Design a binder for this molecule. Sequence first.
Ligand code: PAR
Ligand code: MG
Ligand code: MG
Ligand code: MG
Ligand code: MG
Ligand code: MG
Ligand code: MG
Ligand code: MG
Ligand code: MG
Ligand code: MG
Lengths: 221, 402
Amino acid sequence: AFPSRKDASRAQRKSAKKHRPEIIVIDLKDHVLGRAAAVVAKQLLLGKKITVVRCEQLNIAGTEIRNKIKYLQYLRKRKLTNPTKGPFHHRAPSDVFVRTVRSMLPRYTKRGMKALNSLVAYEGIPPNVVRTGGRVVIPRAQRHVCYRSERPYTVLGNMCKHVGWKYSDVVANLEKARVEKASRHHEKQAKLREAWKAARKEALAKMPKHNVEVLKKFGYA
Amino acid sequence: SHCKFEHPRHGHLGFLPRKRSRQIRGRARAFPKDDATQKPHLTSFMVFKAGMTHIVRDVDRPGSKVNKKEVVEPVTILEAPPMVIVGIVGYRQTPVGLKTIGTVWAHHTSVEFRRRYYKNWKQSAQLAFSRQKQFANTKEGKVAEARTLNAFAKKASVIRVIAHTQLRKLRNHRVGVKKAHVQEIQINGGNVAAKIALAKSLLEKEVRVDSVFQQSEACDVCSVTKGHGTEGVVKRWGVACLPRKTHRGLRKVACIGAWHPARVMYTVARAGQHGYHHRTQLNKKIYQIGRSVAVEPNQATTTYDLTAKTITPMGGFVGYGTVRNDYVMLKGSVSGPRRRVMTLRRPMAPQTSRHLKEKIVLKFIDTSSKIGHGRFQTKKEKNQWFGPLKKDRIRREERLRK
RNA sequence: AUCGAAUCGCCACCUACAAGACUGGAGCUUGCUCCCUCGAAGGCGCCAAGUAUAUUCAUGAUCACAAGACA
RNA sequence: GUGAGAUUGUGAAGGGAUCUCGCAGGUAUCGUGAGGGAAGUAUGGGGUAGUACGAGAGGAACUCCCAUGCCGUGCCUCUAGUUUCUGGGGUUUGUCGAACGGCAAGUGCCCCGAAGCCAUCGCACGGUGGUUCUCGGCUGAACGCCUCUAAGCCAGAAGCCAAUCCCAAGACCAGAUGCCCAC
RNA sequence: CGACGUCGCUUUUUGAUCCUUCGAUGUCGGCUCUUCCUAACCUAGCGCCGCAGAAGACGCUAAGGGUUGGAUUGUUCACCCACUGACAGGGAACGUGAGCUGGGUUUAGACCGUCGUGAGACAGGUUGGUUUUACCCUACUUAGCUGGAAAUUGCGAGAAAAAGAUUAUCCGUAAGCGGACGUGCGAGCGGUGGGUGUACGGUACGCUCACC
RNA sequence: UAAUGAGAUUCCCUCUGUCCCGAGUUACUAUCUAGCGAAACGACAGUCAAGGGAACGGACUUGAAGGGCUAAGCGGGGAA
RNA sequence: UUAGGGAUAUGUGGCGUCAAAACUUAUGGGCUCAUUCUCGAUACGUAAAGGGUGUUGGUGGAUAUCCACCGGCCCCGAAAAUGGAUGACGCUUAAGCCCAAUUAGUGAUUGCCCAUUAUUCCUUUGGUAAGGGCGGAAACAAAGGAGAAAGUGUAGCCCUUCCGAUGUAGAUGUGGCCUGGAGGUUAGGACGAAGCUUAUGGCGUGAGCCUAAGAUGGACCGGCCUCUAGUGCAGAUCUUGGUUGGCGUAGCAAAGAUCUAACGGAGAUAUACUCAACAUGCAACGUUGGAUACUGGAGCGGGGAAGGAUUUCGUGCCAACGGCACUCGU
RNA sequence: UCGAACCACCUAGUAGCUGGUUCACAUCGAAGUUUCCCUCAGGAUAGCUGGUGCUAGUAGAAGUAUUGUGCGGUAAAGCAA
RNA sequence: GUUUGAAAAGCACUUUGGAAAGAGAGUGAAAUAGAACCUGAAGUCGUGACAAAGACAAUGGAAGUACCUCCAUUUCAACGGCCAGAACCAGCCCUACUGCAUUAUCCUGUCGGGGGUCAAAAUCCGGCGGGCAAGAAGUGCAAGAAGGGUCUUGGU
Ligand SMILES: NC[C@@H]1O[C@H](O[C@H]2[C@@H](O)[C@H](O[C@@H]3[C@@H](O)[C@H](N)C[C@H](N)[C@H]3O[C@H]3O[C@H](CO)[C@@H](O)[C@H](O)[C@H]3N)O[C@@H]2CO)[C@H](N)[C@@H](O)[C@@H]1O
Ligand SMILES: [Mg+2]
Ligand SMILES: [Mg+2]
Ligand SMILES: [Mg+2]
Ligand SMILES: [Mg+2]
Ligand SMILES: [Mg+2]
Ligand SMILES: [Mg+2]
Ligand SMILES: [Mg+2]
Ligand SMILES: [Mg+2]
Ligand SMILES: [Mg+2]
C-alpha cells in the first residue's frame, strides 16, 4: 500500500511531518507459540499496534516429528466439494502465527478484524524494522521459564520447512547477513559507548557535591 | 453402495481450471535450474508454428528391433526469426517471493517493439520510449543506468533479458500482428557478474536460434492449445456416451453425484471451454535447426538425398505460407495451431536417458504437397511426369509470336 | 484546499548477539575460597542550556478536549 | 479554498443563504507467486542363466537395455473416417421444343473428392528432491555386564511434503516499466 | 492352527422397536459417474515360517494407483468359460428414476393349479400393461464487467525501504577516496537535422530544442 | 394337429453404430437481434463441516469460507 | 423459579485467548510424555478381557543385589466409509490429573467473575389487606399556591404502612378500549364536517385517545349517560376485486420460399455547426409487372348437405381485434 | 360424466374426524387419572380448577415431629429349624 | 351507482403531429372537477433529492453515538423549568482500629542413653528442677459508638 496522490498532496498542502504510530515490536525468538499468541491476542484487542518479528524462531513443545504430524493432520482438512473454498493452509512461520493469533480473536466481527490487521508478523528482522527502536520480549512466555529444559521442543522454522514453506534458506541468508552487519555496527560506536560512560563518570566531581549525595541516596551514582 | 465395477476416472484433475488461457503466447512458468558452473547462455526462444511434415532417418538403438533400420517420423516446422534484446531485468530473493530490482533499456528500440504499447499505433502520437531515450544519455541518466546495473550486482540472484520476436523479418502474410511479442529469457550459468556481462553484450543485438539450442537435443515447448469453444462432456473429458434409447440425451454424464455431499463436486465432469489452454510438453527432441533461404536455397537436402529442395512444401504450408527464415524442426507435435507463437525452452527433465542422448542424422524430408495427396517432391518432378501441357504450348506460342 | 478534528516519549548512547544445568574473571578443596568493573538500572526527558538573590505570566476570574501540540 | 449542481407541493423576473461531491489519476506492457489444484501407473521380453540353491526333480533375483497394457496431455505429416467445396464427373424420372445451359425429386442416386474436424483406427510427449512409517541397525545407559532407546544417531515405503505441471494479488504486489496528466 | 470357556469390535444382514414422515421424501436391480473407508486381492518396502530353491502360509507400515471380457438369470447373490500382475470387501437416503432404463415388484384384462357354495383368494406360476415439470435459489462447469487495506467512510499516518532522519550533490567502501558547467552571452553530457562507406535488408554507430 | 397370428419363447443364416468406441456432416432449435409475450411456482430466504435436536439444518452451538453484479449451461441439494 | 427498574452480595459454573474474572495468582504438594481421527481435560453423557524391563508409590519375603504381590498416571489391546473437532486456538516450569490454599510458617475473618435468586432502595399493580384524616382551627383583596368527594371500581377522596406479582387449556373481573343504530343531554361545521395522509408530536402499562400540518377534501358530525346488535381479523388448500416477483423470461421451430423494380402511403432519402457520400431514420405495409417456386386433379381446384346466418359485394376506414406485421381483413 | 348418467330439489344431509374462530389489561389456574359405556380418536362420572358465597376470625387445623399404644413379613438372615 | 359541475359554461382559437394526442390559451369557485370525470386508500411502480452500505438473507431487542428534524416543551439577565462542579445535612451501603478465654503431645534447665562426626552440636528417648514460646498462636468467641461510597436515595 503506497499512499496515493490524494494522500500525498495533502501531506504537501499541510506540511505533514513524517509520522510513525506507537508500534510495539516483539522479538519472538524462543517463545512459546501459544503463550505468546494469547498475550498478543489480548493486547491487539486493547488497541495496541503490534509488529511481530522472527517468527521462524518460535517454539512448540514436543518432538519435531510430533508437531509436524499435527500440521499434516490439519492439512488433511479441505472442503471436498470445492477445495478453493476450503481451509487455506498457510505454511510460513509468520503465517502460522497470524492464524494462531486470529483463532484467539473474535474473527467474525469488525472489532476482531480491526485487531488482526493491527498485527504484521514478519519473519527474520526486515530492514524497515531494524532501526526503529529496541525490540521487546514477553517474559512470561520465553521457553526458558515455560518449558522444562529436559523436554524436547520444536523450532517453528524447522517444522514448517518440511510441510511446505520454500523460503527457509532465504530467511537463513537474510539473517546471517544481518547479524554480520549489526555486529560490525556494534564494534563501531564502542568508542562512543565508552566515550559517554567515561564522561558520565567524569561529570561527577565537575558537578556540585550537594547534588551527588542526593544522587547517591537514590543509588544513581 | 459401492460402484459395481471399476474404471479409472476421466481426465487428469491437475489441469484444472479448464478455462481459456490468459494470454495467447507460450510463457515459461519456470526456467531450468541455474548451474553456476556452466557458461552464461539464454534459455528460451520464440518460434512460430508453420505446419508439419515427416522425415526418414535410420535408428541407432542397440537391442531394438529397428536397430540400423529406417523409420518415418513426423516432425513439426517452427519458423524462428532472431529475437532482439531490448532490456535486462534482475530479481532479488525475498521471503515473499522474487522481486524485480529494475530494468535498463537498450538506448534504441524497434518500431515494432514500442508498437506493443499501443492498441492503435498508426492513429497515435507514437511517442513511447521518447523521454527515456533522451534521459538515458543525459549526465544524470547515464548515472542512473549504472546505478541500477550495480544494484543487479548487489542484490540480484536471477538475471533475465527482454527480447522481442522481430516480426518485420518474419515476412509472413497470415500472421497478421505487427507489434512484437515480448518475453523475458533467463540467463543461466556463472555468477551474477558473469551473467550481466553477457546481458550487456547482447543488448540491442539480435540473438539467433542456433546460439541457444543444438541440432540433436530436446527442449520444452510452452504453447497455448488450439481452441474449440464450449464443448460437452464427451468431447472435453472423454466420458462414455449413453445408450441409444435414453430420454433427453446421450452425450451427458448420467449421475453427477450422490444425495450426500449435497453438492456437485469439482471432480465431476461438466461442459464448458475446451481448448485454448497453456501446456508445457517436455522432451521434444530437435532434429534440424534450419537456416534462412537467403543463406540456404537447399534446406531439405540430405547427404543421402541430393534433391535440391527447400523446407517449404509444394503449394506452401497450408494456411501459413512459406518459411522465409531460420527454423527449428522438432520430433512430433506441439500444442497449438499454425501461426501461433511458441516458446522453446531448455529441458528441466534429466537429459540422460539413451533416447535423448541420441544424435540424429536424417535421410529424407518430405517436401511434397500437403494439399491433397503429396505426389511430387519438387516441381521439377511434376514437369517430368506431365510434359508440355496445353497452357504451356500456348505460352510457348506467345513467346514465339513476341 | 476543503480540514475543525480522536492520538500526547524523545534519541546517529536503546535500536548487535547468544545463554538460563548460566552469562565478570580466575583458583582447586568442585563447593568453597579469591580478584574489580561487586555481577538487580540503555540513556535522556518532566519549565534558567542548569542548581545560582533571574526578568514576563493575572481579567482565560473555581472542573470542563491541553484554549497548547516542531520535544 | 476552488469548479459543478440542487433547494422540484400555490403566478413572475431578481439574488441571498444552505446542502450534495468534483478537486488525481488514467492507460499500456513485463513479471511475482501466497494459496488452491495436482499423475502417471503397471507389465512382458532380452541376459543374469539353466547360474545361485538342490541328492535329483526342479529352479530364482538386482544393475542394464528393448518393448507394451491402462491412463493423461496434445496433434493432423501419414493412414483411416466424415463432404452442403452439392468440387469434377456418371446415371434415372419429370420438365424448359431439341442440342447448350440447366432445373425439380426438403442434398434424386452412384464413384472419386480438397480443406477443415477427427480415431488407441494414426502420431508425439509424460521429469526431480526431501521428510519418516514399518523395519534393520550404531553408539549407549538405566541394571558394575547386556540391550536399536531411555538421551542421541544411521539407513529408509508405490505413503506424506515440496520441485516440475495447471489456475493464480479478495494474497488487495511501495514488483519493475512505457507515455500523458496532477503535484 | 486351536476345542472347552471368555472379553469384545462391526452396522454391507436380519430380527426387535415405533422416534420422524400418510394435505406423498417416487419402494428393485442394471447402466452411468465421482468420491470416501480399510478389515490389503495386485503393485512399493518389510519382518517371520514345520522358508534349500521355486511356489506359498502368517504378519507389519501403507488406500497412492489398479481391480476386466463373457454364457444363463429381471436379479443382489450364485455358477461355470477365459484373460490377468490381480480380477479385494464395503460406504455415500440398501449413493445415483425432473439422469436413463422399465426386466422385476406394484392396479384395471386374461389363463392355469390349489382353495371357496359363491362374489372371489393366493409372501403360487403365466402373459399384456401412460415413467410428467427447471426459465427460480444454491452447488458445480465455463464465460464477461467492476469497485475496494477503517475491506466503500477518518483527514485512523505501520514499505520484507533508503539512511542526514536534525541541514541535504553523486560514485564506490568502515578509517579512507573518485568529480561536480562557469556566469542575457558561453560551454558540456544530449534528443532531431546534411552529404561519401561499417557491424549481425533498415535501425544503429563517424565527422533546431530541452537540461546541468 | 396342417393352414392362419401386430400372440408368448428359443436357436441359426444374412445383416448391421446395439456394442467395442466413438467421429463427422445436414435441416430445425437452442443461442443473438426486431416485434410480441405468458405460466408453474413463490412464508421469509438461500455457502459449508461437525455437534445437538422431532433421533438427515438455509437459520441454533463451535469452527471454515464469502467483494459486488452478470451470460450460457447443468441436473447434487432445496427430504423441488 | 419469573411486576418495571437501580445498587450491593451470591448460587450453579468458572478465572490463557475467544470471554467478564488468578494483567498465565501463591512466597502449595505430588504425578504425567502420548509419532497420521493426532495424550489428557466440565458430572448426567453413549470400550472390555488381557499385556508392558515406561515411570512413580506400597506390601510381604529373603542374601547393596534379587523374589512374589498390589496401587496411580502413561502406553498396547483400539479397524470404516464428505474435511473435523476436550466448543475453537492451543497447552507439556500445563492452560492436563489427584489434593490443597487465598495473597502465605506474618501475626487469624470475606482472592474475584457472572443471574429474571437474595438483601435493600424507588415506581406500578392487586389484596381475606391493615391504620389515620374528612363538624373547612384561626387568619389571609388586587396592583406563599391549590386540593380535601363518608368513598367497590375514575385523571383512583387524601395520606401512611405491609405482603403478593410469570403461566398453556380454562374461569372471572374491568367509572377497560373500539364499531353501526336508538333514547336523552351537551356542543361543533363553508373562517372547511365525514374521509384520507404522516420523520405531527402529546399520554395511556395496553386496547386506544387527542392535537397539529395537508400546497387534501367539499357537508355533515363530536363528547358523556343509557339502550341495542349483522359490533374488532393475520392465517379457514378462506370468499370477491386488484396487484406483484418469476420476466422483457419460456417461447411465437409441422404444412419447403421467397427475390426484384416502379407506384401507393404519414410510415423518409428525417443530421446543431466548419460534413461529399458509408461510418447518425432502422424496420415494416399494399398493388401491378417481372423472376423463382409450390399445390399436383384422393388439389391451399369448382359446386352441395348438416352447421353457420350477412361472413357476400362496393366504398370509406385502422381505436380495439387478425398471439409478428399491416396501408390489408371473414 | 358410468362398478349406476345429467339437471333441479329434499339440502345449510350428517360428521365422536380435519381446518378455522376478530380487542387490551388484571386477578386466579389445571389434566392426561378413577368408575361405567358395541367403550379404546368419544362421552357420562369422581378428582384437580374458577366463580359465587355462606358461617360465631384460630373453632372440628396439619403431606412434620415427640411420648404412649397397635399393625406388618419386604431387605437381610437361615437351610446346622 | 352514470355521483363532472350550481349551470355544459363539455376547452373556441393558435401551432407541432397522418392521427391519437402534445404545448398554449379559454370556461368555471375548483380542470390535481376534462366526460363511468365527487372522495381517490392500501399494495405496487416511476422520478427528483438524499442517507448510506462489503460479503453475517432480512426483520428484531437492548444501550449508546453520528447526522438530520414544516415536531413538542422550556428559557433568555441583577433571571431559567438547561448543563456541570464543589460544599453540607440525613439515610443506607463499604472498609480501617480488638478484646475475652485457651495452651502442656508444649517451653526451658541440666544428668543420663543414643546418634553421627575430623573431633560434636543436632535429630531421638528418659529422670525431676522450673515455667508466660506471650503482632506469641493462622485456636474458640468477638459487642472495638470512624476514613470512603451515594450519576448506590432524599434534602438545602
Ligand atoms: N412515499 C412514501 C409513501 O407515502 C404514501 O402516502 C403518500 C400518498 O398517499 C400521499 O399522497 C399525496 C399527498 O401527500 C400530497 N400532499 C398531495 C397528493 N395529491 C397526494 O398524492 C396522490 O395524488 C397524486 C395525484 O394527485 C397521485 O399521483 C398520487 O399517486 C397520490 N398518492 O402522500 C403520502 C406521503 O405523505 C403511503 N401512505 C406510504 O405507504 C408511504 O409512506
Ligand atoms: Mg479456430
Ligand atoms: Mg503448492
Ligand atoms: Mg386377426
Ligand atoms: Mg426450570
Ligand atoms: Mg389463555
Ligand atoms: Mg360478523
Ligand atoms: Mg422461431
Ligand atoms: Mg410439384
Ligand atoms: Mg397482432
